[PDB]
Design a protein around this ligand. Structure first.
Ligand SMILES: *C1O[C@H](CO)[C@@H](O[C@@H]2O[C@H](CO)[C@@H](O[C@@H]3O[C@H](CO[C@H]4O[C@H](CO)[C@@H](O)[C@H](O[C@H]5O[C@H](CO)[C@@H](O)[C@H](O)[C@@H]5O)[C@@H]4O)[C@@H](O)[C@H](O[C@H]4O[C@H](CO)[C@@H](O)[C@H](O)[C@@H]4O)[C@@H]3O)[C@H](O)[C@H]2NC(C)=O)[C@H](O)[C@H]1NC(C)=O
Ligand SMILES: *[C@@H]1O[C@H](CO)[C@@H](O[C@@H]2O[C@H](CO)[C@@H](O[C@@H]3O[C@H](CO[C@H]4O[C@H](CO)[C@@H](O)[C@H](O)[C@@H]4O)[C@@H](O)[C@H](O[C@H]4O[C@H](CO)[C@@H](O)[C@H](O)[C@@H]4O)[C@@H]3O)[C@H](O)[C@H]2NC(C)=O)[C@H](O)[C@H]1NC(C)=O
Ligand SMILES: *[C@@H]1O[C@H](CO)[C@@H](O[C@@H]2O[C@H](CO)[C@@H](O[C@@H]3O[C@H](CO[C@H]4O[C@H](CO)[C@@H](O)[C@H](O)[C@@H]4O)[C@@H](O)[C@H](O[C@H]4O[C@H](CO)[C@@H](O)[C@H](O)[C@@H]4O)[C@@H]3O)[C@H](O)[C@H]2NC(C)=O)[C@H](O)[C@H]1NC(C)=O
Ligand SMILES: *[C@@H]1O[C@H](CO)[C@@H](O[C@@H]2O[C@H](CO)[C@@H](O[C@@H]3O[C@H](CO)[C@@H](O)[C@H](O)[C@@H]3O)[C@H](O)[C@H]2NC(C)=O)[C@H](O)[C@H]1NC(C)=O
Ligand SMILES: *[C@@H]1O[C@H](CO)[C@@H](O[C@@H]2O[C@H](CO)[C@@H](O[C@@H]3O[C@H](CO)[C@@H](O)[C@H](O)[C@@H]3O)[C@H](O)[C@H]2NC(C)=O)[C@H](O)[C@H]1NC(C)=O
Ligand SMILES: *[C@@H]1O[C@H](CO)[C@@H](O[C@@H]2O[C@H](CO)[C@@H](O)[C@H](O)[C@H]2NC(C)=O)[C@H](O)[C@H]1NC(C)=O
Ligand code: NAG
Ligand code: NAG
Ligand code: NAG
Ligand code: NAG
Ligand code: NAG
Ligand code: CU1
Ligand code: CU1
Ligand code: CU1
Ligand code: CU1
Length: 529
């Protein structure tokens, strides 16, 4: 079945918070943006039109593998060139390899924080568990200023610390103090999605246990908890069974991970209360006080319903250290090893599709682009060493990876230093590792993920904290470029080329005109020595 949408971006005032009428990004004049629900193997065709006066746009469908259709991933200068004001890009893709809970968001500057985001649900007939009803909750933080404005003082010489701007409130389904009307003795499938741009959240329901049955599109064995820690971009789908009494109402609770906040403003409501309503007439629940925020479920120990044994020894190991540092222009950037992601003059995919037999040479994709080439079916391992004292949720396009190590917090307040993964010295990896698309490193810690390069494409690996992505915390994976070239489904459509010309962005071979293919590029500001 084909679902066709016609959506146009725009700006309108809303008071999402309850406390500031403020421009938000609308879809055809409406807010919030719609949610898509399709069946396994359906076709989705979205005509996105940039109706904004002065920004570019894009749309990325988070978690979808885009197998055979990399062009549709929606990452400017990886997958497409940006959508210019007035232009219309057609996103045309099938959904043959994904099931469960996903979302879509703009992949331009900070755009999605300003409202351009929505849920994408794929149903399957073979979901193992029973439930009576189903819904979602979209957790997020909310700012009173647009990202464009915050960026001016975020990426600034008057911000040498790289301190990320502090949000004004937590929101659910684009309000505060939300009502969820329930029926007694009923099992609800509750999709909890963190569609925020920055802050991790703790989530729990007063006097109700939660049975985790899916993370990031991957069905899991039932795991019961009282509390979840959800980073931005991740999804926990959870079974909740309601009580027999219609006598009392219960608090739905979301809490900031204030650890991630540079400073805590004294008036910021760190924890927000919503309402699970059994009785429409009874007392609205007060805040549910919790004794500890240290006993949330560690998703590392989750067990996929479809077991896959840990992949064998890696053919390709990528080791990256994560740090924040100041450059020559005095502003604070984010680094994978010694590289801040700096967008190229020609989108990654566009150069692979016109480099012919030189697509295997890493040099042509640029030096300041952090591009790696992955071989036909090789097992790839990413080793990430956090040298920064914060938590980061890293996300990988095109794959759900195996999480084989994710070390403990190394708290610098207790005097502890950063620790890297040591291939010679580490706990035994799990036999059947957890799988997902978005995973956090703990402060000053490390993680190791593994996946098979079985999905020809161009895939972004980055921190999903919008501020850190703006700081350039990302790298590019090119999965067998020859596999990309050989597949017909992968060739760029007339519409996409039309977007590029309308944007005055080339489809050549990184800078140079398909002529020597050895560059004279676009670099990062030089180092501080
Ligand atoms: C859910 O329920 C919550 C709590 O009930 C509702 O939030 C309340 O909203 C009202 C109306 O928007 C707020 O009243 C306004 O208060 C401001 C001053 O606000 C400041 O001082 C407060 C007192 O300590 C403090 O609570 C505020 O903190 C909040 O805001 C900051 C961001 O600013 C945020 O980070 C925090 O997390 C808090 O949310 C804040 O520091 C006052 O200036 C307002 O305007 C008056 O004057 C002007 C005249 O120019 C006029 O426009 C108005 O009519 C008014 O006369 C107004 O009094 C109230 O502070 C909020 N209460 C709390 C405790 O947060 C929320 O709206 C509900 N959500 C929904 C339905 O979306
Ligand atoms: C926060 O925001 C999210 C949206 O982002 C809301 O999520 C939606 O919640 C509603 C329930 O409140 C869900 O609606 C239910 O969908 C079920 C399945 O979808 C079927 O229907 C459509 C038809 O176009 C097709 O996809 C296909 O037919 C599916 O089978 C239905 O079972 C429900 O249908 C209706 O009839 C039955 C009669 O038995 C009634 O019981 C229902 O109430 C209803 O009238 C129902 O429509 C919806 O799926 C959720 N969407 C998403 C994206 O998850 C949250 O509700 C909101 N949170 C709060 C508290 O407001
Ligand atoms: C949405 O719309 C487009 C999407 O691409 C953006 O417009 C482009 O912006 C980029 C950067 O964001 C521009 O790239 C820059 O070009 C500079 C000058 O190049 C011009 O001059 C030659 C002259 O022959 C032209 O051929 C060319 O088209 C340009 O007009 C470069 O100087 C910049 O790189 C580097 O400059 C300094 C100076 O030494 C170096 O030190 C650094 O390496 C630095 O990176 C840079 O590459 C591009 O020109 C813009 N227009 C296009 C492609 O038409 C919008 O920015 C975007 N809107 C927003 C903000 O959302
Ligand atoms: C949305 O994407 C799909 C996937 O490519 C497009 O469907 C395809 O459309 C093309 C041309 O419109 C079809 O090409 C035709 O192929 C036949 C043989 O199958 C050949 O005889 C013709 O000469 C022609 O080239 C292609 O078959 C078709 N595939 C499917 C799955 O239907 C679609 O066009 C895209 N755009 C739209 C309509 O929005
Ligand atoms: C936001 O949420 C947190 C967590 O719910 C709130 O902190 C909690 O505050 C309560 C009391 O205000 C603490 O309970 C105490 O527990 C001991 C048990 O030994 C008991 O003897 C005391 O009588 C008391 O009840 C609780 O520890 C504390 N939770 C944590 C993890 O610190 C916080 O107050 C909320 N923010 C608000 C409403 O301003
Ligand atoms: C449910 O999750 C828990 C942890 O959240 C897993 O059980 C234990 O987890 C600890 C770490 O706290 C590990 O040392 C062990 O794997 C378990 N310990 C005990 C008490 O035996 C469990 O694996 C999960 N169950 C699922 C997904 O079915
Ligand atoms: C969507 O509808 C608009 C009206 O806002 C119309 O102009 C356009 O043709 C439609 N989009 C596409 C590209 O089909
Ligand atoms: C709702 O709660 C009130 C007490 O606040 C009670 O009087 C009323 O009967 C309840 N409604 C039902 C039918 O559950
Ligand atoms: C850091 O990466 C390598 C390390 O040897 C070096 O060649 C390169 O110049 C540095 N990156 C850039 C281009 O800033
Ligand atoms: C891509 O499709 C191929 C062919 O069906 C399949 O073998 C592979 O597993 C797919 N990759 C992903 C990421 O689903
Ligand atoms: C690129 O992969 C090919 C196999 O297609 C192989 O010959 C070689 O090891 C790789 N070459 C480079 C330049 O890394
Ligand atoms: Cu995403
Ligand atoms: Cu993604
Ligand atoms: Cu980060
Ligand atoms: Cu991304």
């Amino acid at each position: 079945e084909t679902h066709t949408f016609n959506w146009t971006t725009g700006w309108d005032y809303r008071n999402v918070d309850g406390l500031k009428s403020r421009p938000v990004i609308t879809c055809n004049g409406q807010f919030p943006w719609p949610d898509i629900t399709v069946n396994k193997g359906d076709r989705v065709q979205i005509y996105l039109t940039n109706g904004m006066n002065n920004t570019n746009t894009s749309m990325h469908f988070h978690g979808l593998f885009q197998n055979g259709t990399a062009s549709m991933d929606g990452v400017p200068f990886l997958t497409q060139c940006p959508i210019a004001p007035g232009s219309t890009m057609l996103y045309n893709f099938t959904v043959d390899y994904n099931v469960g809970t996903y979302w879509y968001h703009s992949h331009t500057d900070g755009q999605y924080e300003d409202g351009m985001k929505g849920l994408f649900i794929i149903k399957d007939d073979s979901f193992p568990y029973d439930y009576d009803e189903e819904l979602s909750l979209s957790l997020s933080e909310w700012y009173h200023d647009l990202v464009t404005d915050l960026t001016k003082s975020f990426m600034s010489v008057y911000n040498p610390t790289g301190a990320e701007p502090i949000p004004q409130n937590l929101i659910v389904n684009n309000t505060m103090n939300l009502t969820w009307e329930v029926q007694p003795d009923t099992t609800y499938l509750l999709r909890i999605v963190n569609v925020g741009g920055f802050v991790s959240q703790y989530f729990w329901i007063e006097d109700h246990e939660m049975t985790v049955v899916e993370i990031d599109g991957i069905t899991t064995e039932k795991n019961v908890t009282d509390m979840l820690y959800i980073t931005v971009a991740q999804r926990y789908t959870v079974l909740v069974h309601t009580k027999n009494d219609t006598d009392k109402n219960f608090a739905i609770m979301q809490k900031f991970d204030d650890t991630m906040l540079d400073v805590i403003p004294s008036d910021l409501q760190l924890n927000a209360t919503s309402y699970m309503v059994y009785n429409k007439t009874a007392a609205l629940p007060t805040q549910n006080y919790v004794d500890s925020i240290d006993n949330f479920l560690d998703d590392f120990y989750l067990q996929p319903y479809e077991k896959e044994a840990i992949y064998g020894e890696p053919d390709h190991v990528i080791t990256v250290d994560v740090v924040m540092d100041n450059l020559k222009n005095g502003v604070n950037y984010a680094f994978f090893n010694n590289i801040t992601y700096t967008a190229p003059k020609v989108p990654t995919l566009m150069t692979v599709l016109s480099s012919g037999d030189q697509a295997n040479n890493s040099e042509i994709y640029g030096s300041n682009t952090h591009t790696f080439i992955l071989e036909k079916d090789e097992i790839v391992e990413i080793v990430l060493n956090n040298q920064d004292t914060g938590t980061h949720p890293f996300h990988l396009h095109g794959h759900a990876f195996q999480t084989i190590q994710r070390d403990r917090t190394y708290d610098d307040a207790l005097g502890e230093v950063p620790h890297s993964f040591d291939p010679d010295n580490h706990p035994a990896f799990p036999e059947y590792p957890m799988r997902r698309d978005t995973l956090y490193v703990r402060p000053q810690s490390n993680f190791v993920i593994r996946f098979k390069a079985d999905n020809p494409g161009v895939w972004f690996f980055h921190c999903h904290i919008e501020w850190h992505l703006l700081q350039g915390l990302g790298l590019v994976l090119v999965e067998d470029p020859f596999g990309i070239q050989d597949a017909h489904s992968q060739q760029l459509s007339e519409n996409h080329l039309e977007v590029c010309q309308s944007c005055s962005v080339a489809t050549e071979g990184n800078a140079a005109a398909n002529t020597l293919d050895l560059t004279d590029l676009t670099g990062e500001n030089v180092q501080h020595a």
